């Protein structure tokens, strides 16, 4: 009987496995794009000529 | 626009709702696997019509 109890728990975790992987990959996409936005924005200073700005 | 046999489909929508209430797994997670599947498929037939 206890094997069936874990069987659903294992089945719940397999669906929780796939769900978090898509969740992590979107935040990893967003945390990348915020980071590469900030680091390129640190080049901004008044010495930049206006086309290069 | 080749071929769409909704006689095979609106049966298949209805049997998914039929097999939703019918199933006797005796477990608590398939019981909300099928309920989420079947409530989509019924609403899928409604929203198509």
């Amino acid at each position: 009987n206890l094997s069936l109890s874990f069987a659903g728990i294992h089945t719940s975790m397999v669906d929780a496995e796939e769900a978090l992987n898509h969740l992590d990959f979107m935040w990893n996409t967003m945390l990348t794009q915020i980071t590469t936005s900030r680091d390129k924005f640190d080049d901004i200073n008044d010495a930049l000529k206006l086309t290069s700005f | 626009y080749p071929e769409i046999n909704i006689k095979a489909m609106n049966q298949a929508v209805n049997t998914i709702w039929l097999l939703a209430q019918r199933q006797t797994s005796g477990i608590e997670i398939i019981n909300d696997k099928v309920k989420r599947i079947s409530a989509y498929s019924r609403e899928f037939d409604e929203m198509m019509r």
């Binding site: 719940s12 669906d15 929780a16 796939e18 769900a19 978090l20 898509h22 969740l23 990959f25 979107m26 | 997670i29 909300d32 989420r36």
Partner: peptide, 13 residues
């Protein structure tokens, strides 16, 4: 989107 509404249910299940 990638993270669908069925994904977030499966976690909350």
């Amino acid at each position: 989107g990638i993270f669908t509404k069925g994904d977030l249910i499966n976690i909350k299940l």
